[PDB]
Amino acid sequence: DRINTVRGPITISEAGFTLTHEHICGSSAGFLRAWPEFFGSRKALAEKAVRGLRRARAAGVRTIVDVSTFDIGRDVSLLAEVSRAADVHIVAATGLWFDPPLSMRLRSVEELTQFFLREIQYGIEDTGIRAGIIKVATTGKATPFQELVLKAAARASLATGVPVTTHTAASQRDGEQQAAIFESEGLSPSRVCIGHSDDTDDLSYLTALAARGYLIGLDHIPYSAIGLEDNASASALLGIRSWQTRALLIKALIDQGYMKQILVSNDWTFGFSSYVTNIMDVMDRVNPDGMAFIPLRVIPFLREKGVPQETLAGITVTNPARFLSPTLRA
């Protein structure tokens, strides 16, 4: 039915062009509140986010999905502030990424399910803001704790119709184990996006997941260290495959008939504290378009390669709404 955003529930008709894997700020729980000067100031960070969201809106974006979890330092009051100021819908997330503190990593699968349900059904912190997606992660074979998180996320999705989206080490085919765990919980693949999937060139892996009904998150398109290859930290984060190579995976999935299974995004952010201090600046140097990279650079690139505009509208408008609108089977 309706999709919860930080300003309240919206209808499918209202979502419009949606970026399905983004961030306002990539941090850690408590960090923005304890050390705002890391970001210059809270005001500076908010201003930067508003400018970038307005940039994206001007390029046609209407909704982003902020897949920052508790342990990414999600601050839903910041999300609400910038959503209002930029007039861009923002869907907030629950789940856990790969920096859970002791108070999360000691919890059982039932306890984690309760937490994710709280954030979806009741609200985040004392804000009343309800999550519209559940984010989870692996980096290779799931750790024991990550298996509990995947199972809890599946259970929370099965109780609410709120989809699950993942971080993968795509080149290691993590999506297969994630899918196997999800299906062992009875979760429908139509409620799951296997993200960071443009990090691999293995089209067989991607098409096989798409044929099983998964959504394939091609969310790293602007990530490339070309021109800065001997920046070790940037190379590790961004890789050295070109944005064009990544974008051509969108075309390849289209050409093999899987347009309904594709979700595209930038995995952008406006603040970034969980890595090297000035990674945000390096990223902004790599992709000055920020969140507008998909509409301004990727869509025209794919048009030039012969992809019809109606296909691209299906990917960027129709697929996200079908993914986000709550259901147990889409």
Regarding 278 and contact with its own copies (CB under 8 A), the answer is no
Angle at 64 (CA atoms; ends 274, 100), nearest 5 degrees: 30
Options 1, 277, 304, 306; binder of its own copies; rule CB under 8 A: 277
Nearer to Zn ion among residue 193 and residue 262 (C-beta): 193
Residue 220 is among the residues annotated as catalytic for this protein: yes
Contact 129, 80 (CB under 8 A): yes
Options 107, 167, 191, 220; binder of Zn ion; rule CB under 5 A: 167
**Residue 275 C-beta: closest distance to its own copies, Å:** 6
Q: Which of 71, 167, 174, 198 is catalytic?
A: 167
**If contact means CB under 5 to 8 A according to the sort of partner, which of Zn ion, its own copies, none does residue 24 touch?**
none
Q: Which stretch binds Zn ion (CB under 5 A): 28-36, 205-213, 262-270, 308-316?
A: 262-270
Angle at 256 (CA atoms; ends 255, 261), nearest 5 degrees: 100
Q: Which of 48, 89, 151, 196 is catalytic?
A: 196
Contacts of 208 (CB under 8 A, 6+ apart): none
d(Cα 145, Cα 100) in Å, to the nearest integer?
10
d(Cα 101, Cα 160) in Å, to the nearest integer?
26
Q: Which of 304, 321, 254 is nearest to 11 (CA)?
A: 321
Annotation: binding site for Zn(2+): 21, 23, 135, 167, 196, 267
d(Cα 238, Cα 104) in Å, to the nearest integer?
29
Nearer to its own copies among residue 140 and residue 288 (C-beta): 140
Q: Which of 187, 198, 191 is nearest to 239 (CA)?
A: 198
**Residue 102 C-beta: closest distance to its own copies, Å:** 4
Residue 167 is among the residues annotated as catalytic for this protein: yes
DSSP string covering 128-163: ----SEEEEE-SSSPPHHHHHHHHHHHHHHHHH---
Options 66, 71, 174, 198; binder of its own copies; rule CB under 8 A: 71
> Tokens for 15?
């979502």
**If contact means CB under 5 to 8 A according to the sort of partner, which of its own copies, Zn ion, none does residue 102 touch?**
its own copies
Binding to its own copies, residues 211-230 (CB under 8 A): none
Contact 132, 156 (CB under 8 A): no
Contact 179, 197 (CB under 8 A): no
Q: Of all residues in this chain, which one has the CB nearest to Zn ion in the complex?
A: 167
**Residue 230 C-beta: closest distance to its own copies, Å:** 20
Alpha-carbon distances, residue 166 vs 26, 57, 291, 310 (angstroms): 16, 25, 19, 27
**Residue 79 C-beta: closest distance to its own copies, Å:** 15
Q: Which stretch binds its own copies (CB under 8 A): 159-167, 260-268, 273-281, 291-299?
A: 273-281
Cα of 180 vs its chain's centroid, Å: 21
Q: Which stretch binds its own copies (CB under 8 A): 31-39, 43-51, 156-164, 219-227?
A: 31-39
Regarding 267 and contact with Zn ion (CB under 5 A), the answer is yes
**Residue 312 C-beta: closest distance to its own copies, Å:** 35
Binding to its own copies, residues 111-170 (CB under 8 A): 111, 114-115, 118-119, 124-126
**If contact means CB under 5 to 8 A according to the sort of partner, which of Zn ion, its own copies, none does residue 267 touch?**
Zn ion
- Spell 237-262 as b/e; 16+ CB within 10 A means b: bbbebebeebbbbbeebbeeebbebb
Residues lying near Zn ion in the complex (CB under 5 A): 167, 267
Catalytic residues: 21, 23, 135, 167, 196, 199, 220, 267
Tell me which residues touch its own copies (CB under 8 A): 27-31, 33-35, 37-38, 70-71, 73, 99, 101-104, 106-108, 111, 114-115, 118-119, 124-126, 273-277
